[PDB]
């Protein structure tokens, strides 16, 4: 219903052997589409969705440039930060940033955000009012202080409400196709014997996109929540997804046990059974 | 469209 365009920025010092690693990764609707790696030779902004090959040569030149500069900016922030946290010069550290825009169904900025983190803890963030900062600590205070001093909030807000939101549109139109696509899960129930005249029933779900899916096990119409082993959903690398849910059963009583697969691509929730 | 980050130029704890 809503949609979004976020960029994930990573900087990692790899000392004492030189240049930090710079990583930028763009996602529309939580699907990667552009990426930048300081670590390749000929480091450049690459497309990671075919519908993005559609963009000209002058697009990539533009984004690379900015990436290049951003990289240089974090290269020193990494090094500045050690001094402020009285930290040893040998070890490696991590600046991370998430910035982008979620938009409503009415194509309007719904929540804008930009949050930094140093070594996996919060460091500073933009507040919902798009005008103020929250500083995680004494170090981030000085940053916040300068960023107010220089009128940063307004300049980001421009990007956040303007540029970002416009380009989410351009990317969407570009990809209505590949993005709102939908593959229903292929499901089947395996069976394995357990020592004590027990059985394990495993309900499988394979090759589905998008990634959210809920499978459930019941007997006598009641879901068996405190009985299921169930794995985090995982990439086939297709990129479809996989997930399974299993549960212990007495040998013979299996026919009383049903599996249930709720996923947005299938018209009516599946109801499965062995054999 | 990637934004151009401003330098943090921090100091502190």
């Amino acid at each position, epitope marked *: 219903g809503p949609h979004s365009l976020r960029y994930f920025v990573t900087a990692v010092s790899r000392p004492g052997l030189g240049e930090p690693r710079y990583m930028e990764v763009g996602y529309v609707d939580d699907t990667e589409f552009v990426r930048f790696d300081s670590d390749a030779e000929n480091p450049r902004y690459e497309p990671r969705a075919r519908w993005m090959e559609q963009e000209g040569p002058e697009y990539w030149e533009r984004e690379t*440039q*900015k990436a290049k*500069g951003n*990289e240089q900016s974090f290269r020193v922030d990494l090094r500045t930060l050690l001094g402020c946290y009285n930290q040893s010069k040998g070890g490696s550290h991590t600046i991370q940033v998430i910035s982008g825009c979620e938009v409503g169904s009415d194509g309007r900025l719904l929540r804008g955000y930009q949050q930094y983190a140093y070594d996996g803890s919060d460091y500073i963030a933009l507040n919902e009012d798009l005008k103020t900062w929250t500083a995680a600590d004494m170090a981030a205070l000085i940053t916040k202080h300068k960023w107010e001093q220089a009128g940063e909030a307004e300049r980001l807000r*421009a*990007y956040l409400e303007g540029t970002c939101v416009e380009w989410l549109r351009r990317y969407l139109k570009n990809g209505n196709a590949t993005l709102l696509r939908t593959d229903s899960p292929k499901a089947h129930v395996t069976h394995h014997s357990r020592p004590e005249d027990k059985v394990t029933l495993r309900c499988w779900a394979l090759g589905f996109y998008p990634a959210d899916i809920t499978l459930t096990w019941q007997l006598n119409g009641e879901e068996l929540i405190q009985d299921m082993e169930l794995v985090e959903t995982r990439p086939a690398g297709d990129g479809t997804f996989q997930k399974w849910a299993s549960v212990v059963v007495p040998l013979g009583k299996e026919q009383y046990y049903t599996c249930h697969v709720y996923h947005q691509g299938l018209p009516e929730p599946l109801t499965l059974r062995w054999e | 469209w990637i934004y*151009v980050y401003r*330098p943090m130029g921090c100091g502190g704890s």
Partner: T-cell receptor
Amino acid sequence: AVTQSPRNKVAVTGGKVTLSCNQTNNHNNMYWYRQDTGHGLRLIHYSYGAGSTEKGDIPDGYKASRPSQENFSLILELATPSQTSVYFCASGDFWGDTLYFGAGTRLSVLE
Amino acid sequence: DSVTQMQGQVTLSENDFLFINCTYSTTGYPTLFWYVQYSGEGPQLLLQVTTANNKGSSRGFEATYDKGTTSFHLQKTSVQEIDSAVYYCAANSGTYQRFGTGTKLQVVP
């Protein structure tokens, strides 16, 4: 502040020339521009920071080393009279922010 | 990312009102600048604004970020003659900064 060395310079065609720019601002980006009648400020080389050197609009004739964050120098490997001109160095805190310029250097090249 | 300012020379008398023309072509949301370059010297940021539509002022010049026109017209209520200099307009959305020929202002007493 950004300063330029030397400020004035005479050189014979075919010789080597280095203009160095040293910058007290703590800036990553630096640019070398050339300036002359009818064309104004034209970018030659620039540097996102210590290490890199990217070509600008009119690189032929010039090479630029970026040893540290403080120094950016351009080198006319073997000079021509077409490179007689006034040269300007600028620094920049980040990408597309204000530029701070040097006082320029006057370079006449004659055979 | 481009800028066009249609005046090569402009000259006037002191106390005259000054107006120099600026329109830009850009793909992102550029911040906008006026740079001034007093003869003998290198250029210097006269003024900037980052958001439409506000106006910057320095040394008694001003200019408004005119998105509807894509304009950044430099205006001064009473041009003095210290102000004789070359004035450069410029946008920037994260490109590298280039400069036109700008406008050569001669103020005469």
